[PDB]
Symmetry: C2
Subunit: 425 residues, 2 copies
């Protein structure tokens, strides 16, 4: 119903000039707001320069070359190799295929299974949707065979009666051990994890989770991939979610924030060990992988170069670190409400989960659509937030000021007051 | 290793100032070349006024609605629906999921297999890593590629070959069971397969068979879409009506990543009636395409259709073929094949027996590497080299392309002989 032609800073603006503070950042990607001038100028400069091309082995744009070097620099790796795609979904599919390719070239073509977690979201294509752990995919007859979903490490939801957080983490470690021993380590191509789960509802992992599961994966030679599609470039208060949870992955998947939302592109940064192994495989078999044609775009790459520079050198990632404590403190105050079951998140990605009864964690009945009601009321009050399950998510642009932060929570709290009073009746 | 900075018309230029005629149009998509001022200005204007593009808030932008109308208009369909993705490959995937969704919603969840002609390029069993990246989705069922020169039996006519492939298709449907088959996808001319136009009369023989069974027909126009075969769609040039079209590449002339699935009337209605009957809307389908992309696609479609580029393909195609015909007189060219502005040359060590050079000699690779040295870009595929230049190519530039390619063929065939 609302006609929107553009945005201004962190606001979506309708044709009448009403401003809606956008706590979805567009599609969880507009870190620099909707009209950032340096980003817009960089997009334009590249169209005038070289508006399109495709990267091949031995032939690519100067933009591809520069962004590859910049991504290795800002990755946790001292060296590595980069390729590009059009989206996070394609980046995940291609990473999976590269592992299949690699393990097959290494004489283990049965090493195919992919481990993810329930509530993970990796994309919308057949493979990345099979990696995804959501009920809605049953309507497609997904997941495909060989996509194994581990329990989601969301302690609040999945911890058993009297189970402590430490015990929960030991149980997930046991479960991983057992899944590996049952399936057979030789048949498992890789494990992919968003450090903090995004579309699953903004779920940081229980304390110690990555510290417990990484030694296990390493023991069994199962490559570890960090999906940074949402966490990447500063949203969790370090450049990468995997830094924030101190695990060293074998490769990184990136998108969204990579271009500050101004251009659809994906990137896969391969760390030193997978790069060395791929290089040796390709050398050994004496040809380039048949059918590999993944590429981004020179305009996407130029805009990404500018996005990285803005986020890192013009104060945006720093704004997230400085405002993250005030962000959390205000959430903590909101979670005092009887109908807020918990708040969770880190950096500039958070969620609030609605409950009908706090002590027992009982949700409101599905048909009441409490999340949607909250989200609709926020829109009426000039705030946009995403309803996910029984939660509402705040993932606002990194350019958010303290005043716009207050503005966001003032509106949100007025919406919660109204919705909770109204469903109470 | 070549680092490319910019282009001009159909040429690219590297960091050292070398220029190369890019006979690949980037990779099929850059149909208007590398510095088309109308398209550049239109794409710059989108950023200048970047849309309030959102995951869920606000009405679909005017550009997106307008592209959907234009796509249905220019499609062979009288009406239908459009869904958007970031690429040809994602739209392919989306169309497959859409069929899975629809057949399950109509009560046949076992209807999942996709009929396709895809295939990979002694003492040994083969290598599993050589067909990972092309491999279609699980449940694909393979039909023989209708490449007459390659697969026709000794002394078998093109007509008999097509009749043999009609039998194959019938026999395949009977063996798998029609109730387990979700659809048939086809590129009218096969692209990554090696630029393979189908044997004369192929679609006229297989379509009636597919139509006996309710196996939706999808025309994969990611390469053939918007003029490359000398008409607006490949399916138009081979005179058939699919139930849906997959589109990608030329759609924005390479200026912006986007794909589209264009559903015809019948699949549009089945989709809508199943969305209601199941009371679930399929996740990750969207009518809301990227508005910058949608605006750039409007401009690209107008350029190609109304500023003479699709017409130039039709006009220069006979000269493209004459010259290929002449090249194919060489003892080490087994054939030329193609139509409009997509063509291939196939290298052979012995013409009469269709014997290729040993894989280890990498002959296509050598041809394409020699082309680069002489200022021409062409793409090696299997034992073939492929030409798909921008639609803006002039007759002087075509001559230039072939003069360079012929010098490459001369050098490679001699080096390889003397070896």
């Amino acid at each position: 119903t609302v006609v929107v032609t553009h945005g201004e800073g962190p606001y979506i603006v309708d044709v009448n000039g009403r401003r809606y503070l956008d706590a979805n950042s567009g599609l969880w990607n507009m870190v620099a707001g909707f009209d950032h001038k340096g980003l817009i100028d960089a997009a334009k400069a590249q169209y005038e320069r070289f508006p399109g091309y495709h990267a091949f082995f031995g032939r690519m744009s100067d933009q591809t070359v520069m962004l590859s070097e910049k991504l290795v620099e800002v990755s946790p790796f001292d060296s590595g190799r980069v390729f590009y795609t059009n989206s996070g979904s394609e980046a995940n599919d291609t990473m999976v295929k590269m592992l299949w390719f690699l393990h097959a070239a290494e004489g283990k073509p049965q090493k195919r299974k992919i481990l993810t977690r329930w509530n993970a979201y990796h994309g919308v294509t057949a493979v990345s949707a099979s990696m995804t752990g959501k009920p809605y995919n049953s309507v497609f007859g997904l997941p495909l065979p060989g996509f194994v979903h581990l329990t989601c490490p969301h302690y609040w939801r999945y911890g058993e009666e009297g189970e402590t957080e430490e015990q929960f983490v030991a149980r997930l470690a046991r479960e991983l051990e057992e899944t590996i021993q049952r399936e057979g380590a030789d048949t498992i191509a890789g494990f992919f994890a968003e450090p903090v789960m995004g579309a699953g509802g903004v779920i940081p992992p229980a304390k110690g989770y990555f510290q417990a599961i990484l030694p296990i994966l390493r023991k069994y030679d199962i490559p570890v991939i960090s999906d940074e599609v949402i966490c990447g470039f500063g949203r969790t208060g370090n450049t990468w979610g995997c830094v924030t949870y101190d695990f060293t992955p074998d490769a990184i998947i990136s998108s969204k924030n990579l271009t500050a939302g101004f251009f659809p592109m994906g990137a896969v940064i391969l760390g030193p060990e997978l790069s060395k192994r791929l290089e040796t495989a390709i050398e050994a078999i004496e040809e380039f992988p048949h059918g590999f044609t993944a590429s981004g775009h020179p305009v996407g790459c130029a805009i990404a170069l500018k996005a990285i520079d803005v986020v890192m050198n013009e104060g945006l990632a720093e704004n997230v670190r400085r405002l993250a404590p005030r962000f959390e403190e205000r959430l903590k105050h909101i979670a005092e409400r009887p109908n807020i079951g918990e708040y969770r998140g880190i950096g500039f990605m958070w969620a609030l989960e609605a409950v009908k009864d706090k002590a027992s964690k009982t949700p409101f009945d599905g048909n009441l659509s409490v999340s949607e009601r909250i989200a609709n009321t926020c829109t009426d009050l000039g705030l946009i937030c995403r309803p996910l399950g029984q939660s509402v998510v705040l993932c606002p642009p990194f350019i958010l000021t303290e005043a716009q932060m207050d503005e966001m929570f003032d509106k949100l709290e007025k919406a919660l007051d109204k919705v909770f009073a109204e469903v109470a009746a």
